[PDB]
Design a protein around this motif. Sequence first.
Motif, PDB file in Angstrom:
ATOM      1  N   UNK A 124       0.843  -1.200   0.000  1.00  0.00           N
ATOM      2  CA  UNK A 124       0.000   0.000   0.000  1.00  0.00           C
ATOM      3  C   UNK A 124       0.876   1.246   0.000  1.00  0.00           C
ATOM      4  N   UNK A 128      -2.339   7.709   0.081  1.00  0.00           N
ATOM      5  CA  UNK A 128      -3.628   7.241  -0.434  1.00  0.00           C
ATOM      6  C   UNK A 128      -3.495   5.724  -0.434  1.00  0.00           C
ATOM      7  N   UNK A 129      -3.708   5.100   0.740  1.00  0.00           N
ATOM      8  CA  UNK A 129      -3.629   3.661   1.030  1.00  0.00           C
ATOM      9  C   UNK A 129      -4.403   2.712   0.126  1.00  0.00           C
ATOM     10  N   UNK A 130      -5.360   3.238  -0.637  1.00  0.00           N
ATOM     11  CA  UNK A 130      -6.131   2.389  -1.548  1.00  0.00           C
ATOM     12  C   UNK A 130      -5.481   2.238  -2.922  1.00  0.00           C
ATOM     13  N   UNK A 131      -4.282   2.792  -3.041  1.00  0.00           N
ATOM     14  CA  UNK A 131      -3.473   2.664  -4.241  1.00  0.00           C
ATOM     15  C   UNK A 131      -2.218   1.967  -3.743  1.00  0.00           C
ATOM     16  N   UNK A 175      -7.186  -2.859  -4.372  1.00  0.00           N
ATOM     17  CA  UNK A 175      -7.720  -2.381  -3.098  1.00  0.00           C
ATOM     18  C   UNK A 175      -8.847  -3.203  -2.495  1.00  0.00           C
TER      19      UNK A 175
END
Lengths: 257, 257
Positions: A124, A128-131, A175
């Motif tokens: 991760x 922006x942890x969802x990328x 994600x």
Amino acid sequence: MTDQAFVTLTTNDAYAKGALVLGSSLKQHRTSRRLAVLTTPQVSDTMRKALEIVFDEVITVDILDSGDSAHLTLMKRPELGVTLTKLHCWSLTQYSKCVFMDADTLVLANIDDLFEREELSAAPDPGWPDCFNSGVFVYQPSVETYNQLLHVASEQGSFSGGDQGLLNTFFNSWATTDIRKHLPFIYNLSSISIYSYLPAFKAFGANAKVVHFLGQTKPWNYTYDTKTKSVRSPQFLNVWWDIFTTSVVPLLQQFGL
Amino acid sequence: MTDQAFVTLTTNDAYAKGALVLGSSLKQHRTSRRLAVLTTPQVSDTMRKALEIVFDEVITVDILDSGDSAHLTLMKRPELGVTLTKLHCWSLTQYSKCVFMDADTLVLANIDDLFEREELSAAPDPGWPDCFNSGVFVYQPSVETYNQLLHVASEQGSFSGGDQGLLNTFFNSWATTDIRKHLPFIYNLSSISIYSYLPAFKAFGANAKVVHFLGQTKPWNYTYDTKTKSVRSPQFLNVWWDIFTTSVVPLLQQFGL
């Protein structure tokens, strides 16, 4: 073994130093896999010759040449030069599975267990942890995938202006699908997160397997005192420099003769 | 429906404003669930009375009192006062499943679909992505779990000094197990990540369902011009303030009489 490899990229001499240190760290931690490096013509002959010693394979890529498959896409989106060169990692069909690692990363422990992962596996990205961060990823070389990625680069481009936006756009199920494709953060530890988020690091940072030197200032931009074995105003930077000082510099001196 | 709820916490009057805005936003987006708020005696009677209108249930918790189960742990680790109070969310056994939300969050869209998740579901924290942010999480009230969490707080404490370190230590399989327990980042969008990481936000930020106001400066610390409907040197802060100005302030005026 022979059909699996770690792959990196160098577009200039500065990043070639990083690639040399990266390749050396992988050897230091005894990888059983091959080491490959993508290089451009802008990399000097002396750096290229050093890369030929550290790496098992040095592949030349020149997207500025009309004969390159990505050249046309480059003309359409010239700011994607580095991204398009990096995408050539998918063209290395001599390998069945590879772990791509940017030249500004450093291996602190054997990470051959990454070859147990499937494309596309990545850690991760902080912020922006969802990328996923594109600094370290497990992929499968394929001409078809390379062509699909070029197509997306041409039509959509990259939302980040670099390879990360494009890769996340293409491998968009990351994600929300398959926790195994989420590489633990210690396999691509952001240097920023280390000096920035202290509590979390103090708790899990000792398990770091790979350090990713982010930000404007790269390892080679620091001043290193060879006597005290420390950079000037750092443990990871010092490891990078110890390898550079011990294995890389003397290797580059072999050619002066 | 009646046995499921959104739960928040207010330990003072400043955070009570946030809780009032949060509760109002949940009503605005038509939640079918109950709204509960944990409050301490330090919250004034006027704020408490306003909370009684916005929330379906106002629960008083006083860990400073010897009769509280967490009091003894507080004496051992006094810096964990807020954390221990927050842990009482697990004591709300009148509910079968809840979504805890810190008082500094703001709902921008209906998020009742979170009740499809299992404990412990939470979004990744920026900075150290392998830890979940404790600002928004799905859990199951249980006396046993509450007791286990108190035990960990007593013996180990928190590596972050707050509730996040403790929760990550206890629910430690989050990073490597079950992708469904990774709530999408849009369900707990860090305000920092928005103004900081622009490219990523410009690409996915329009889908934001919950904004988490982090950093030193909270929404209530800003100055809001009621004429231009904007905070002084912001879209999300303006939404917070529009709700505060429209629904919360006039509600607090009902009591002056």
